[PDB]
Amino acid sequence: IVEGSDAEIGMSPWQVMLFRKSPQELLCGASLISDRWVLTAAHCLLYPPWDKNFTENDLLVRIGKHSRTRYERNIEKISMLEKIYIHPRYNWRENLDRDIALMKLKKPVAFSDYIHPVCLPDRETAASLLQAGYKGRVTGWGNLKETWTANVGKGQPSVLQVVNLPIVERPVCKDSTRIRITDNMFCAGYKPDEGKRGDACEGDSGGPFVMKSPFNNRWYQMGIVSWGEGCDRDGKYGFYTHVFRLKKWIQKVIDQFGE
Amino acid sequence: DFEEIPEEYL
Amino acid sequence: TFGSGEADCGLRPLFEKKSLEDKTERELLESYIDGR
Numbered sequence A: 001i002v003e004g005s006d007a008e009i010g011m012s013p014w015q016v017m018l019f020r021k022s023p024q025e026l027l028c029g030a031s032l033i034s035d036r037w038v039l040t041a042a043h044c045l046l047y048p049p050w051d052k053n054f055t056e057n058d059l060l061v062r063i064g065k066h067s068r069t070r071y072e073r074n075i076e077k078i079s080m081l082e083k084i085y086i087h088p089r090y091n092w093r094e095n096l097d098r099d100i101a102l103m104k105l106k107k108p109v110a111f112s113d114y115i116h117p118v119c120l121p122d123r124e125t126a127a128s129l130l131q132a133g134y135k136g137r138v139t140g141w142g143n144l145k146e147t148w149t150a151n152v153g154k155g156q157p158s159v160l161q162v163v164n165l166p167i168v169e170r171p172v173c174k175d176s177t178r179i180r181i182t183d184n185m186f187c188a189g190y191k192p193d194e195g196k197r198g199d200a201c202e203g204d205s206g207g208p209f210v211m212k213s214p215f216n217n218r219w220y221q222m223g224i225v226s227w228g229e230g231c232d233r234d235g236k237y238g239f240y241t242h243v244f245r246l247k248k249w250i251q252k253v254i255d256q257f258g259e
Numbered sequence B: 001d002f003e004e005i006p007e008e009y010l
Numbered sequence C: 001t002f003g004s005g006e007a008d009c010g011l012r013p014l015f016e017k018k019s020l021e022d023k024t025e026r027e028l029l030e031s032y033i034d035g036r
């Protein structure tokens, strides 16, 4: 996260780390949506242009964390994957449309003060809250400064970072880029004029864009960190997978097994 | 860069 | 069943459950046409 701040403890108990186990590295963020299911971006697992194709045994999920690099000994839980599910129409050839994947955990995590699932939006929550100008919140352990152009100024955080960003109008989104934007995406970020900055950045992909409902005070995940051009570049915006538009597939796959 | 995790996780 | 279990979703043990607010959540709520 670029221009964010350190998260408080327990501020985002659904945040998950996607961790590969050899070499040990952070791949991406993710989110806990029940005791056995994790949501992330499909491009974290599967991206043929770069010969990226992770399977279950390649990966660990780490839940309950705050420190990026510490093994957080009586706090985090580490889990193994039993099944990865990518959207059958994820478009990695062109524009990362339907950039979504579900992961089944080998066995359920227990909740705690540090581990708690986020809600998924329904129609009226989506309708009400997904409006330009409304702010949501993005969290992650990715770079603090632009890294598809690998950067200094500090580099990597020690703790989970947070930033709050406005949703932007679709015309301005589509006018900022040459990429074809779909209805399964939205964009977010401040405009060049507004004074404030901030963005997700490398290593943040796959993580939650969340909003808090003013009607029932619950946190809902509205987006997944999906893509962008650079990090925090003026006149560019982050793009997020639209979680409500792909909710039938999510329900479908967690109903089919589903046991 | 990461601290060592327990070998029951690999 | 209820949700996927929860039901309890999106209420954080250390914040909403204890009626405590985080440092920046007012910024979000104030952008939602403030409210009143």
Ligand SMILES: *C(=O)[C@H](CCCCC(=N)N)[C@H]1CCC[C@@H]1O
Binding pocket: A028, A043, A044, A142, A199, A200, A201, A202, A203, A204, A205, A206, A225, A226, A227, A228, A229, A230, A231, A232, A237, A238, A239
């Ligand atoms: C994910 O970590 C990044 C980009 C996420 C931030 C995009 C932005 N809002 N500037 C992906 C970029 C290429 C592969 C990475 O997974």
